[PDB]
Amino acid sequence: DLRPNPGANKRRKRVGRGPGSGHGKTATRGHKGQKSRSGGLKDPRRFEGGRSTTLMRLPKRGMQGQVPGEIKRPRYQGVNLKDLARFEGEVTPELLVRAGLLKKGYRLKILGEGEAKPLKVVAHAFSKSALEKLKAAGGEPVLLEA
Amino acid sequence: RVKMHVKKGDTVLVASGKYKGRVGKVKEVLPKKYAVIVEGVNIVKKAVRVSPKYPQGGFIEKEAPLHASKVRPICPACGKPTRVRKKFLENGKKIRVCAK
Amino acid sequence: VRKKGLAMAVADRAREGKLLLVEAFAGVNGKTKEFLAWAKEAGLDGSESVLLVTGNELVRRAARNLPWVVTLAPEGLNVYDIVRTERLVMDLDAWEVFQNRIG
Amino acid sequence: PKMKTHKGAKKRVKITASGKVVAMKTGKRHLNWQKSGKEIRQKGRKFVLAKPEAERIKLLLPY
RNA sequence: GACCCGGUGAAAUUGAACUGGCCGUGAAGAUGCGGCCUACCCGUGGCAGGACGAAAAGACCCCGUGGAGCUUUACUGCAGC
RNA sequence: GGGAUGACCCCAGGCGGUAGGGGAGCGUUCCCGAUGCCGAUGAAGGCCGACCCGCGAGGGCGGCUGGAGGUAAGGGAAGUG
RNA sequence: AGCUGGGGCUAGGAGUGAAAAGCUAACCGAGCCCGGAGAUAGCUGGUUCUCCCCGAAAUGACUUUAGGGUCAGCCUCAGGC
RNA sequence: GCUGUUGGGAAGCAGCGCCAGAGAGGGUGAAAGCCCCGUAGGCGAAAGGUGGGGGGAUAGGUGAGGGUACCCGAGUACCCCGUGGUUCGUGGAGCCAUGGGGGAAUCUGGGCGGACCACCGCCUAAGGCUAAGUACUCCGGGUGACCGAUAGCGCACCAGUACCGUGAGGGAAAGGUGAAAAGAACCCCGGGAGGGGAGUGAAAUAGAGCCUGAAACCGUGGGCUUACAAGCAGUCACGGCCCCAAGGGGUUGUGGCGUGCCUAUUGAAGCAUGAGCCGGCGACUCACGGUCGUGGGCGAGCUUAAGCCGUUGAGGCGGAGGCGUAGGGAAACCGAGUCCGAACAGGGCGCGUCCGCGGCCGUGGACCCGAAACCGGG
RNA sequence: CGGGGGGAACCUGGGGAACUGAAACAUCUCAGUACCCAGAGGAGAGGAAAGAGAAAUCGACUCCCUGAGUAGCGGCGAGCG
16 A cells, blocks of 8 residues: 555544634633633532532432441343344353353343243243243253352 | 774875875874874964064964864775774784785 | 454555565575575565565564665564555465464 | 542432433422322422433443 | 033833814713814923823722631630639 | 536525634644655745735745755644744 | 940740830731642633634523522534424 | 765765665764764673572471370450541441550460351461562663753753842853864054954854844935824825836825724723733643544454563553443342232333544643732741 | 661651632541651561451462442532542
């Protein structure tokens, strides 16, 4: 290939916005006209008025956490038998981490959408539904863990 | 000592500028200036004797410095850069296809 | 995107008719002399600039100091060095690694 | 250098799968004494509008 | 002392100036717009009506969720007792 | 609307403008382009120009000075007017 | 209850004070230097090349708010209908 | 690596060669691989430093059962009071540390696993030492999309100086002849300072705070022009005179028109702010997060961090991890559903990533300059 | 025999602010930061479990990346983490 015009295509635009001249964004600088466009202003997102944000709303999202922090408890990850359809033989956790879902996220639970497939399928649980669909050839390796 | 270079008090050929191709004896070396002397560059300096003892000092006036890179030593043959030979004991300089 | 670039960069160069991968290097003991002679027989006249990749360190020492040739180990293959050069010359062992670096 | 989540909102407003911002109806934590069964009942959750764009921007890491 | 001559020679201030009067006008107190009147070009010694003349980002006045000194049966603290 | 898309020609509207929003450019320093190319038959910078191109920011060309550096096309970065 | 020379001591919320908030190295209602420090300043001022298109507001609600702000209203760019 | 050619001067330009593990870079009268200093590549320490990296040599370390139950760090543990540290702000408040009071035991000993009890488990306090992987840059060296003398350190220069202040402390300015000094003999005017000739030089309007030498500012000469006109100083028109040519350039006599610039304002020629003029310095950024947009790569996937290897302006490797592939519910949980509910009522919520670029936002002065003041140590 | 004093940063320990932020302010923040003192050295600190924490688990300490702006802390404010 040549040397010049490998050149950036279509739209790179590194032409950012400077404000200093008679034409463009002049005098007071491309915005501002007033006081509190000057080297800091309060937020907004949350702030201001000095009204009450809306922190008049209320934290019913109760169960916010006690001192020594979280409780370790075994956490479960969903995956649809739809997603399983892909591959054949026998499916197990970690076999799944080496793909889209589960990854490290611990205790596998197969459930839900799509038609089931003839393969034994190790899991920590199922939805009732997915246990039923998986009657169409396939597993009840459940129980697990020790 | 950081000062050091090519030639000493001896016959050298200039390849310089004005005095290009010249062959002169002893270069009377600086090397503060990396300069030499030969009978190459020459000029007039104005005078009246440091003391007018023997009145005027004279008027012919003598040789300018000349950059040591302008000169190039010589023997059985011409210019030649210098090379440096072991000698089996000491160390002397011999010219390329030549000696001393 | 780097694989792509690297693959493509060579390709443009292949399409141009510039990619020539070789085998013969009697131009040994990396002497500029030796390489140059060898180059003459390979029609590498020094009329265009050339990117030479090879694992053979003697041929590397061989070019280098030539001012129309850019010398390079194969792991150093890269688009810029490819592009800046007009002509591309590879060891077959270098072309082997270039293979691996893609797929 | 890395934004912090604004705990005061995390603590009181869910973010839906659309990305609407959901908050409990205000106004029945002690008021009551006798407001209609309708009042005290009619407090499950709700949307907000334009003010959620703001509330979202503060739950910045949790998305 | 001031004035004239010979020797040396500052300063604040200063948008630029080719810088008149009256009646009007105008951000409502005009050399600078309008109309009219007046006026050859340039100095020097004098006066202080004007240039809202100079100097100092008004001491008064209010404003700022500005400061600081002082007070107390303002608050909350501390030293001390 | 043509459409031998020619960014080149017809048809019709519009084109005061502060805060602002948007869009296209110009120029300065540095980088690749460069082991290249321009330079003592004269670089950069400076002094003229009633000449040329650009709507403009600017770009050339011509003379004078200057005396050794400068740097395309096309990209990139910023102590950029 | 005098003046004055020399040699000493007392200091910064501290000294000294026949008392004025006086003096404490030419500005003391809390010294001076260096440091935190580029304190903070909802205030005043200043903000640098060119061309092209569009183009506001000085209302409402709340605001220890009222010359500051948050949402709404009015401007603009892109996509969509 | 020589010659030839212009030039004051070749390294330019030309002819014909050569070296290259060396075509990095500087210098040489201009622009040189082959003139010089270098570069690639390779040598070198008597002396004094450094030195398990490779050797040696010590110190040192090398058991089973079965019994006794003699020892296993004290004002210590432990508890209470008062506090500190930890993400923990008295909280349900453990753990670690301890100023005060009280005050054990030696393996049935004792601390802990977030008040506390009970199981189950973890560890052995009240003695001490321990490299390396980590930080920093007075100092040596290497690099630079770092500065180039109002910049870069305050300081390129004899600067922490001159100067200022009792003192702590404060703190400047000021670089450049030329290739070579060849730095101008001697004559002339002058007291000298300065000139004028001569002379050197490629050049002296390169002549010594000497390269380049912009503007303000001050002169001299020349053209046009003005002493009965009134003015933001210009402009439009005519006409005259002056300078190279049917076209210009300069100037301005009379006529028409005409309220400076910036800021701040409802409103400024304004008798409202700023500004003597000229030159230089002088203000919207960068890091990391975020959020839109856009150029791309791959896609139910996308992507790697620290590091490791390789380069010496070369790229690789590295999936810990991160987003996305599923939602609802405070939670237990259930799941294409789920939450409230007695409910086959109702209703609420329920379908990409990586890199570049740009707009904007949060955190850091975050567009630049400015306080009155507060605190610490002097 | 040792000590003493010096050393640009860097380290440990003993003491330890305020402007500021919270759009006032006291709890909170700035921040165990700035600064003062003592000490250490080419580094310093730490270091071989009366540890972690729920795992038939791991196995000195230090440093980097993760974990994570999560767990939590918080006039449940600002913010801290």
